[PDB]
Amino acid sequence: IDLEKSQQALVQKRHYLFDVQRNNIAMALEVTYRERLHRVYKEIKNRLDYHI
């Protein structure tokens, strides 16, 4: 009994953490694209603030 569940324990463990590695890198590209759209507004706000 204890070695039958030892089969099934590693097949629910592995598919959870192998999609966490999908989504831990998925957030790494959104927060570097959201900060790409935001920064290009910041360095054109400096010229909208300087000449006044």
């Binding site: 204890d2 070695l3 030892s6 324990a9 590693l10």
Partner: protein, 56 residues
């Protein structure tokens, strides 16, 4: 009485020690039965360790 001459019994004693080494050789010791329970425990524990290594 003080009997004599001895050519008798002593050749009929070593035929007897083919009998007594036949009967008493087929006996059973209670202790040997406690030894076979020990090796069955360590084998499945290593087999579970072979299953734990099949996990790890």
């Amino acid at each position: 009485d003080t009997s004599t001459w001895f050519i008798t019994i002593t050749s009929m004693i070593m035929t007897l020690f083919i009998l007594f080494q036949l009967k008493i050789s087929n006996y059973s010791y209670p202790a040997s039965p406690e030894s076979i329970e020990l090796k069955t425990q360590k084998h499945s524990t290593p087999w579970e360790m072979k299953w734990t290594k099949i996990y790890l």
